[PDB]
Amino acid sequence: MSLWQLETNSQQFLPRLNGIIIDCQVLGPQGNYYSLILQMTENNSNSDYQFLLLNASDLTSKLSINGPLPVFNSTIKHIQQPISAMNTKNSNSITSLNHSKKKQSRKLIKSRRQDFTTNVEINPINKNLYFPHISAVQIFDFYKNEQVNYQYLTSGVNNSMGKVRFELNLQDPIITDLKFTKDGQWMITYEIEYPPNDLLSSKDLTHILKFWTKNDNETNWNLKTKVINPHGISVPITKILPSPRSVNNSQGCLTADNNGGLKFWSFDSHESNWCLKKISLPNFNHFSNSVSLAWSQDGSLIFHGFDDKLQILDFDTFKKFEVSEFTLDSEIQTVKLINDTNLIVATRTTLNAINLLRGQVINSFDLYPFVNGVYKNGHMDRLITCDERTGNIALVINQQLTDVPTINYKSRIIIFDSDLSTKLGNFTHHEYISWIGWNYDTDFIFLDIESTLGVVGTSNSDIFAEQLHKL
């Protein structure tokens, strides 16, 4: 933000604002406060407005106001990027605006992939809500309904300078997956750093993994360890699963590839840094983004669901159990166990409850009519959530149309008891629900594309006193 002094044509600056300035104003009888509107153009999926009230005295933020800032997979409703000098990924030129609006409407109406599911996490110790914004994490307290922090978890040109013209084509590293260990003292983050264009190394994405720690009193996560290119070179970390309490008192995690390799990392006190404790070979030439990991509460066995096949692997040997092979009709999107006995597996065409104890399917529900190609691989995992005491939940979103599809949606939540024998409850909301997850209490929190976090869960003195207060 530039204050131009018109008397001498000089100027003063306030740089490194959180976002580009949509609007400015001088608010006061004497211009005591400046009111600014910021955009945070990094998130192209949605328009993220932040209202800032700065004290003109020392240019310090007197009041910063912004709601939850999720990053949906695709653009929503009528969101259009602002106007710039050139047509880029984060901006629209003069001509591109109308054509882009028309194309967005056509995409929303005609196309069949309508995935807007956003990743979110919940801090167990604090129950704060963590949003993986592009190259950053926004920590938001839903009890108080106010933001608590905004931290850059990545390298890259993020707030070093204001990108302009061709620089605006640059892509900052994207924080893909974010998860906490059970105890809540360790934060695991996964990054994909995109190379700049027009270079030899313009087609080798860099996969990064990081481990952070903080004391409860502190509010900033301090990076403790960094792994560059885990699992090899140019091989994404599709899934991350923090370890249960039984295995290394919740100081361990699993990472799983699209080559079906599993790497078990742990925190070693002697080294004082995380170490690669166990490995499985990702050598088979079968590539699929649809992998799901579940871990038994005791920690002995691990369920690795890759493409259409599920594996029961011993943790101690980190190999196949010695039926460990379970074939499925289609590729598995999600594997979880509602309780230690029952394992719920969701494939692209149905969902099935299995007894590990019997090795037989109890119930099978047909998902194909509602989920056929709407969602990309792995996102059903963030649409499906399970409590560890009462039961699980399924979330199904429908495009509602009257006389060709319309933009507005209708979502439906279903509570299910363990093994899916009965529907404990059935509810409907009037808007697209991006994510539903299980708060560590009995209640569940879900997020709506309108950025609305809903929850589903179970005498003369007396006259003299008044006058004195008036005076």
Binding site: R112, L281, N283, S300, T327, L357, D366, G373, N398, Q400
Partner: protein, 600 residues
């Protein structure tokens, strides 16, 4: 978890009281102090014979014997080692009947007979405890009196639980304090539960509750780690101390088939959430938490086996997973002979790993919603297919595809309702029985593309389809979970290049090298020698398969003459790969005085 063969300790005497094999367990008492995880001694009280102490290892042997007259029944027995006024001594306490007229309480001290004492007790000594630290002997009486005695049997204190007809009493230590609880039958299947604390009065009552619906006559009771287990009519009821609240009920189907009266059952605990159950000559090791049968064994050389006691592991604190149980084994024959048998027990790790797939308890697509938004009979068919004549393809295909409304000859996402494994397995059986030789129905092509093709029919599937190339190709491309063994054998046996490349790609996609490499070792040296020779004569999956061969062959088996030829071929291939790689990068990538002619 595993069950060892029982090994004999001693042969029970031929006494009339012990002739009743059903009641034989009641007449043999096991000392609690001497039988635990770490003890190598067993003190046993046999009614009418003696109270004897046996060393288990290295060989079973008798160490001590206290004779008893044949007319007496040992009601309770306990032995403990400790220091008494200080000499290391072993204190033995036992209570006997002579025809119910009189009740004898006896305490014996031995130097490691220093003293022997005898008193007349008021009611049946149901169980006996020895406290060596305080030099006390505590006896519980069936009339409800708990009497504390010194080692000389001088009465120090007497506590009455106010209820008579006591049937069961058991001690347990928690946080260093000794606790005891009792079960007193009442009328109408009602039971008084009481919990007592041993510390002016040394006995304190902590809990007193009446339990309804608790029968004794057909119930077998044992305790472990704050949980009381009652077995009745094939259902194990789980009660939680200190209130003995019923937590869980576990149905055991294998006991439900037992005719009442002829089948003899014994039930003891062996570890946390694990119990030992006998059904005549059969022992089961059961995990109650996951409801699984960890291990089962049958003793063919005995008519029945009765558990008396088991050394229980606190495996949450113990790294030992091995313990022992003692029982009475009865032989088959006109003159059955009863003997004391000890069995070694491997409980396991108490994790779900052990219980997977061993449960002792014995599908149609359902819409998500029963009831303006954009949308993105197995038995009858089998019977219709079964009724057809042999070698009739057209009708067989027509019934299958039409009745199921299948539109394509290969599986699609629209055939999900057909996925039920039971229906698919039967149809495969019909195809084999109905059709043999050179002609198979088109349904087989559909089923081969089915992702849920049964594993039972995968074996030899390639061999059946060898005759027809098209079915063979279809199996390779889409048949799920085809064996690696059959694929690998066909790889080195088939001479067709297209099949070789197809098989190679399928093998690598669906199997790991450590899985493949072991099987490649099994193959004969000649076949692998031929395969290499074909090479020297998409290709990368064929090359990368070669590297797996060269690994499996090992260093020693490889012979120099061939190795040279493989070298020249590879050296050529390496040069070509470098040459092509360069081409790929290629595709991606004024003078002071000048003379000119003016145009005019």
């Amino acid at each position: 978890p595993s069950l060892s063969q029982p090994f004999r300790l001693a042969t029970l005497p031929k006494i009339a009281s012990l002739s009743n094999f059903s009641l034989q367990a009641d007449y043999v008492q096991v000392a609690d102090g001497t039988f635990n995880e770490s003890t190598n001694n067993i003190t046993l009280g046999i009614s009418g014979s003696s109270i004897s102490q046996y060393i288990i290892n290295p060989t079973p042997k008798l160490t001590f014997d206290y004779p008893i007259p044949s007319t007496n029944i040992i009601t309770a027995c306990n032995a403990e080692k400790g220091q008494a006024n200080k000499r290391n001594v072993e204190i033995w306490a036992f209570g006997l009947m002579v025809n119910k007229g009189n009740y004898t309480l006896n305490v014996i001290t031995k130097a490691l007979f220093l003293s022997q004492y005898k008193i007349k007790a008021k009611a049946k000594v149901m169980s006996i405890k020895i406290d060596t630290k305080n030099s006390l002997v505590i006896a519980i009486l069936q009339n409800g009196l708990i009497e504390i005695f010194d080692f000389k049997l001088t009465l120090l204190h007497s506590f009455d639980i106010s209820y008579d007809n006591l049937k069961y009493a058991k001690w347990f230590t928690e946080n260093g304090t000794e606790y005891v609880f009792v079960l007193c039958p009442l009328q109408d299947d009602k039971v008084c539960y009481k919990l007592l604390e041993l510390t002016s009065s040394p006995i304190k009552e902590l809990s007193s509750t009446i339990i309804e619906g608790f029968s004794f006559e057909n119930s077998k009771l044992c305790y472990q780690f704050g949980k009381l287990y009652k077995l009745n009519q094939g259902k194990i009821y789980i009660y939680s101390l200190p209130h003995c609240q019923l937590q869980q009920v576990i149905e055991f189907p294998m006991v439900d088939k037992l005719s009442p009266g002829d089948d003899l059952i014994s039930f003891q605990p062996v570890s946390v959430n694990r119990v030992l159950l006998t059904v005549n000559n059969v022992i089961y090791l059961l995990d109650l938490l996951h409801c699984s049968t960890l291990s089962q064994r049958e003793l063919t050389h005995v008519k029945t086996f009765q558990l008396l006691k088991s050394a229980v592991i606190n495996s949450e604190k113990s790294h030992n997973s091995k313990t022992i149980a003692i029982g009475i084994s009865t032989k088959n024959g006109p003159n059955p002979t009863s003997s004391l048998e000890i069995i070694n027990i491997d409980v396991g790790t108490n994790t779900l790993k052990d219980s997977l797939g061993k449960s002792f308890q014995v599908v149609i697509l359902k819409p998500l919603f029963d009831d303006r938004v954009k949308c993105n009979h197995c038995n009858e068919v089998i019977e219709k297919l079964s009724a057809l004549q042999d070698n009739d393809i057209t009708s067989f295909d027509d019934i299958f595809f039409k009745e199921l409304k299948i539109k394509e000859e290969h599986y699609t996402e629209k055939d999900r309702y057909i996925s039920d494994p039971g229906f698919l397995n039967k149809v495969l059986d019909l195809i084999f029985g109905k059709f043999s030789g050179n002609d198979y129905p088109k349904t087989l092509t559909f089923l081969l593309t089915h992702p849920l093709f049964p594993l039972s029919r995968t074996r030899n599937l390639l061999s059946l389809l060898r005759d027809q190339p098209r079915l063979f190709k279809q199996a390779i491309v889409t048949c799920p979970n085809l064996p690696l063994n059959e694929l690998l054998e066909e790889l080195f046996s088939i001479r067709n290049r297209e099949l070789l490349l197809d098989i190679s790609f399928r093998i690598l996609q669906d199997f790991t090298r450590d899985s493949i490499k072991q099987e490649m070792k099994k193959l004969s040296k000649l076949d692998v020698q031929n395969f290499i020779e074909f090479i020297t004569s998409q290709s990368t999956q064929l090359f990368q398969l070669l590297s797996l061969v060269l690994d499996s062959i090992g260093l020693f088996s490889l012979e120099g003459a061939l190795l040279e030829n493989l070298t020249l071929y590879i050296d050529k291939q390496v040069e070509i790969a470098e040459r092509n790689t360069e081409l790929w990068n290629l595709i991606d990538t004024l003078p002071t005085y000048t003379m000119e002619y003016l145009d005019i």
